Design a protein around this nucleic acid. Structure first.
Ligand SMILES: [K+]
Ligand SMILES: [K+]
Ligand SMILES: [K+]
Ligand SMILES: [Mg+2]
Ligand SMILES: [Mg+2]
Ligand SMILES: [Mg+2]
Ligand SMILES: [Mg+2]
Ligand SMILES: [Mg+2]
Ligand SMILES: [Mg+2]
Ligand SMILES: [Mg+2]
Ligand SMILES: [Mg+2]
Ligand SMILES: [Mg+2]
Ligand SMILES: [Mg+2]
Ligand SMILES: [Mg+2]
Lengths: 291, 120, 25, 102
RNA sequence: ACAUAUUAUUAUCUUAUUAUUUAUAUAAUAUUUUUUAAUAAAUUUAUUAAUUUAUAUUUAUUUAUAUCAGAAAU
RNA sequence: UGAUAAGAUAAUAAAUAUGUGGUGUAAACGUGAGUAAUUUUAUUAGGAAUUAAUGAACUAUAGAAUAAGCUAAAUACUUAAUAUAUAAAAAGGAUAUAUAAUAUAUUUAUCUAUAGUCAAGCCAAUAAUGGUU
């Protein structure tokens, strides 16, 4: 019924298809074999009724998981349970281990912190399962523009919301985060700004190997106002809008950089008609803090 | 013991008075079935020494009759001795310490008499 | 039947040989 | 042979009788926590003390192991499969698959 | 006479199973092959479901022969 | 490690043989129904077709052990690669040490080839109870 409910059904059908046995796949999903399935009377696992034909499965849209991520209740384990079941698949099922994109992990980390309120257990499922992604030939998901930056951004909010000020815990956690990055391609340059802001906030001098200086290269959405092309473009650059607004709000040193404010102007004025992504998130963190 | 050709003891004699044939046999055949060859005989009961002999220093002797040449041939072609037969062959000087195991390895035990080959 | 055709083939062969014996004798 | 020395894992006879297992902790009163008795009593003495055939042989094997610095951890006796011995497994499995899963 | 039991045989009847040998499929699977939608990714390609194409491997039915056994006769 | 504890990773110590696997039951044991011999027994200094790319499983020596798929995973299975007209293969595990998963070392297994050992197939000659009512 709801967008979340529909997305979950699509995501659960996709997994059931790819977890079905290869010998039995042609007889359970090709509608021309419905009568051959009946005759064989294969018994559904769990000693249930014999298996029945299912509708053929087609490649799933990457937007399907973005809808489910933002449907999870304010305090729920549904996102943490889906990920644990999704990433428990064999590393031989390429469709399952290649569906996850860098955007999905960013949206799983930003939703968990500001909306679902289980960030700690979402950064442990990702840290714990990073090894399987490498064995499954999908290391790109752990990058600097979607995984590292989003993590440091949520840290710049938890360190404030919670007041954490230890200069040893912060550095240790920052080192682990950088060690968890498998696709180190700094492009926007916001990573260096984010790392410097963390050091000022927690009174330490960051020093990570391989984070070479990169000048800001914020993608500028054009003044042209399209429909689904600009709704996708904004949603595409939604993560870096949450990072620009965060950088300025946490520390006023980032106000020095004028590239950050141009993107705010462009991204905000691009669809200022609609609500604000940054504000919407801030509200929920308070709505979750109160509990 | 492994292999198809094994050197092992086949039991003869009467109840409570065991005597043994040293035989080369197929692993799958019965213990007392007619073997490939009978290499020798083993009498497990030591010969009793008299009171005087004991003080005199006589040690009880267990008697083994064995075809030394034929036994070496069967070891050469890969016949596998049983544990008891292995002990007998190591004492006879046919096999060496390479056939000893960790449980019976007499690495540190004094030798009172050294193996002596004579003619009689 | 296949067994009735084999029987007759053999029966004819035996009768030809029994006659052969009479022609030879 | 000679009397080995108590260790930290096996401080006394009661600890020895518990590590070896096979219900040998029920002989703690036969030995009376005397270290020397465990390492001097042979089969004939143990038989006179009421230790049954299987247990006394097992203890003597573990006493030899201890004397030679070999592990004395309990090794369990073999047990038949859950579905029974091989000769009665086909029948048992057939009657267990028609009374559990139908 | 005969009523019984047992066995054997067959130009006969019926026949499980199996082997071998026929014909057939809009049969299944894989690959190839002709196209066709849906979906997805990227900005043509992939996937899935169909259709066409041959190929191999199976399946169902079917032709013929032999065959446990039983029936009848001796 | 995870800013709160759900999980992950490694080390250590245990558990599991109601999951997938390996090896073992062509032997041994028992019996004498059938079997009078195209088949069974016994014997011979017997034989050829002039007996397989068979090792069954140990010995000696030499070499090799590759890539995918399928299963939850593998020393399971499937399809390929390379190895004596040429054909025909495989498998890792344990423990250390050094590295950034890989490499060596040790140990135990896997595959192939050659010979040996054990062990097989087939044939001949001669003999093997009673009744010709
Ligand atoms: K009997
Ligand atoms: K008989
Ligand atoms: K090895
Ligand atoms: Mg062994
Ligand atoms: Mg018929
Ligand atoms: Mg018949
Ligand atoms: Mg099992
Ligand atoms: Mg037999
Ligand atoms: Mg390999
Ligand atoms: Mg594999
Ligand atoms: Mg295999
Ligand atoms: Mg192959
Ligand atoms: Mg080849
Ligand atoms: Mg008469």
């Amino acid at each position: 019924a709801s967008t979340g409910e529909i997305a979950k059904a699509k995501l659960d059908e996709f997994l059931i298809y790819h977890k079905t046995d290869a010998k039995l796949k042609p007889f359970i999903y090709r509608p021309k074999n419905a009568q051959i399935l009946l005759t064989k009377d294969i018994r559904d696992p769990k000693t249930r009724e014999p298996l029945q034909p299912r509708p053929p499965v087609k490649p799933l849209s990457k937007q399907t998981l973005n809808d489910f991520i933002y449907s999870v209740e304010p305090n729920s384990t549904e996102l943490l349970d889906w990920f644990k079941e999704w990433t428990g698949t064999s590393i031989r099922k390429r469709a399952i281990w290649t569906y996850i994109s860098p955007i999905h992990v960013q949206k799983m980390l930003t939703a968990s912190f500001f909306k679902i309120g289980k960030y700690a257990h979402m950064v442990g499922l990702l840290y714990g399962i990073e090894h399987k992604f490498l064995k499954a030939q999908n290391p790109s998901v752990f990058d600097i523009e979607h995984f590292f930056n989003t993590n440091i951004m949520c840290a710049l909010h938890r360190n404030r919301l919670k007041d954490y000020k230890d200069a040893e815990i912060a550095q240790r956690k920052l080192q682990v985060a950088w060690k968890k990055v498998l696709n180190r391609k700094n492009n926007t340059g916001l990573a260096n700004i984010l790392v410097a802001t963390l050091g000022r906030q927690i009174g330490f001098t960051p020093e990570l190997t391989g984070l070479q200086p990169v000048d800001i290269s914020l993608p500028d959405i054009p003044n042209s106002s399209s429909g689904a092309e600009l709704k996708d473009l904004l949603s595409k650059y939604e993560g870096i809008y949450l990072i620009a607004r965060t950088l300025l709000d946490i520390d006023q040193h980032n106000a020095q950089y004028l590239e950050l404010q141009e993107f705010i102007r462009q991204y905000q004025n691009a669809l200022s008609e609609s609500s604000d992504p940054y504000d919407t998130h801030l509200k929920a963190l308070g709505l979750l803090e109160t509990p | 013991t492994c292999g198809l050709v094994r050197i092992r003891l086949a039991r003869f004699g009467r109840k409570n008075s065991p005597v043994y044939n040293i035989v080369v046999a197929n692993s799958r055949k019965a213990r007392d079935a007619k073997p490939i060859e009978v290499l020798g005989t083993y009498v497990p009961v030591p010969s009793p020494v008299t009171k005087r002999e004991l003080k005199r220093g006589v040690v009880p002797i267990k008697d083994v009759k064995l075809d030394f040449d034929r036994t070496k041939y069967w070891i050469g072609v890969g016949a596998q001795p049983s544990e008891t037969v292995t002990k007998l062959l190591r004492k006879a000087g046919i096999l060496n310490d390479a056939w000893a195991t960790s449980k019976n390895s007499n690495v540190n035990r004094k030798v009172v008499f050294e193996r002596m080959e004579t003619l009689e | 039947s296949a067994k009735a055709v084999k029987f007759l083939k053999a029966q004819r062969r035996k009768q030809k040989n029994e006659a052969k014996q009479a022609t030879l004798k | 042979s000679t009397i080995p020395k108590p260790s930290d894992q096996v401080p006394d006879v009661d600890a020895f009788l518990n590590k070896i297992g096979r219900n040998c902790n029920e002989l703690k009163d036969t030995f009376e926590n005397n270290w020397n008795n465990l390492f001097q009593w042979d089969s004939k003495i143990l038989k006179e003390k009421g230790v049954n055939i299987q247990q006394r042989k097992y203890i003597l094997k573990q006493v030899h192991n201890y004397r030679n610095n070999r592990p004395i951890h309990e090794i369990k006796l073999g047990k038949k499969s859950f579905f029974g011995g091989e000769r009665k497994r086909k029948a048992f499995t057939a009657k267990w698959k028609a009374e559990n899963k139908q």
